[PDB]
Symmetry: D2
Subunit: 203 residues, 4 copies
């Protein structure tokens, strides 16, 4: 009795099998939408930290603002960290509950965090740039490749790109991904694209 849970870059989850399989068990869709969004050159992390790239430099800087710090504010800023948990049945994946910030409706608990920020014209009310960044964490060799959106012997090639991924077995929930240290740093970092817009991924 074990699983693989795959949080993907479209705000979706999936249960596959490590039982000769890889076969899709259950496959969840919530009302929250994308996992990374940006009208926006500034590249958001899932974190969601904020970074500046201009191709004149190598300079990929972190900037002194995060999608968080910007909410506690010429241009008036709005947004909202969410925190809603589900509420699932390890296999079948049918929500027992979904209990949000402003609501609650009655053994595998899938919590969505989603931070946004918009910037609108003060007179105008209409936004000029925005950011929505979210992610999934849960509680009660499975190698992922991230540029080749795959769990890997069976293999399940996803599209869209993979965000979090947990194998659940026995004791459950453990995720997947001098010179040698100089070598071990660049695999910590990954840039993806969805669909659409650039993003970072973290370690």
């Amino acid at each position: 009795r074990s699983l693989v849970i795959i949080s993907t870059l479209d705000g979706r989850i999936a249960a596959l099998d490590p039982e000769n399989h890889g076969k899709k068990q259950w496959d969840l869709d919530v009302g929250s939408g994308s996992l990374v969004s940006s009208s926006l050159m500034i590249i958001p992390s899932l974190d969601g930290a904020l970074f500046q790239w201009d191709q004149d430099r190598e300079s990929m800087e972190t900037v002194p603002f995060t999608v968080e710090s910007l909410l506690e504010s010429d241009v008036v800023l709005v947004g909202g960290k969410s925190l809603t948990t589900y509420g699932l049945s390890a296999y079948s994946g049918k929500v027992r509950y979904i209990c949000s910030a402003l609501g609650c409706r009655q053994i595998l608990l899938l919590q969505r965090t989603q931070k946004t920020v918009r910037a609108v014209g003060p007179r105008s009310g209409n936004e000029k740039w925005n950011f929505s960044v979210g992610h999934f964490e849960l509680r009660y060799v499975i190698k992922v490749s991230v540029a080749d959106w795959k769990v890997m012997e069976w293999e399940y090639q996803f599209c869209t790109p993979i965000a979090s991924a947990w194998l659940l077995k026995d004791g459950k929930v453990i995720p997947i991904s001098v010179e040698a240290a100089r070598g071990a740093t660049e695999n910590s970092v990954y840039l993806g694209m969805y669909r659409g817009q650039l993003y970072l991924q973290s370690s």
Copy 2:
């Protein structure tokens, strides 16, 4: 050039200190109360950081958390969330010229923009979504872009005195407690405050500048 006020029902109100204080066309937006507790007994400030008060121990002792914290924390799962939003009002008078939450920017057509922050946190236990306790603080903020007015709390009356002979010119009374209050004359929004011969002159100031009221049964407290 007038005096906006917010309160603990959540609503907002603007007056008219030149026309003897009389409210002029005043509505608002739903989000519930400005404090909703549901938990010897902890007390929420509207800032979001809260205090236990052991009524035996008379122990208004600052419990090492906030409403913000718990959301970035076993027995119960801490759901919740903060929300900021802007109700740009052509008021005087009305006049929802737009609204902007994380869920869109529905506009309007036809100069006072109005912030609304809300900090809830339900705690529910994981076997089923049963709700074990929750706090939801909040507060509007004020910004405008193109007598002597006081709002001491206790009674819920905003009052205009004068600089001349310090007499009361007019006074307006309120139903729920004043949360905040701002005068809007000339343009620059002015916030009315709702608060060894010095060692008590300056002690006076310190017990002056905490208000421990209660609204809709809820025990909450303010300060500066």
Copy 3:
């Protein structure tokens, strides 16, 4: 057994309560004194906050600053250093066994005393004239195997220099010491029971809970 008194001139003193008050050891770290502050007027709490007083509006205003908060910052540059060192002691009698800090550890050939100290100075070029300061110190207690006041700098031994923290030892447990609309007043009673504004050698200062 004994009672420990962190007092506001950086000192410690141990009395035992089952003997009228007889002292015993009494620690005088080198670190000086607790609140110091080149000060209508800006008042720090101990621990670290800063509070603006205006005698016009007669309110005690909050400032958007902390002594730490200012180190992570015009014409004036900011200086300081949050320090925090622990002193091992013997519980009785005396006596510093080991000591300290960010800058080394000495053990000399059961009751562990931690000092914290936040500074901020404000200097500005060309020549660096310090225009003001704020230093707030601190103390916490621990250990390995009676009604203090606050207004009178007094215990049940009458102290000289105001008190800041104190504590009990018993069956090995540093236990600290404290310094209808009818129910509201009783809570409304405890909110002005929390904050204390004092005076120590010039600087006016705050304490609360």
Copy 4:
């Protein structure tokens, strides 16, 4: 028109009076070095965030504490400092020094520094440390290849130990120097993994 190099031995230096390249003065201030580790390896930032890599894995994971979040907690000791050294743009020679202990007398080089020890509770013995710091300054053909511990220009000046920041003065300004696939390129070149003396450390931008 100067060039300034703060290096991992707690010393700064000023080289190149626009034509020469000759270092016109070089002050050192304690503590000593810009990075300590003592010392499953856990490697600090100059910041210092804390990271753990295991060669059993291929990944560099970051840890949930920084040299500061743990200062507010093994008994842990430590302290962030901020000391400023005032000297005149050229020749050096310190005019003021304002640390946490008062000002002394008679272009401003601002050093920040976090340290943390871990000692035994009952016995004041130790058990790891972390001291990390770095330099800032303002007032009143430049290039570094940090892995080759030198500035270049014509000419080049190799330092020991590796150099960390590099501010150039010219006029009245202090300027520093350090498809998706090409963006993929700007991140493996954003971080640098170093060594001193002795111990490993991390860097950003770079």
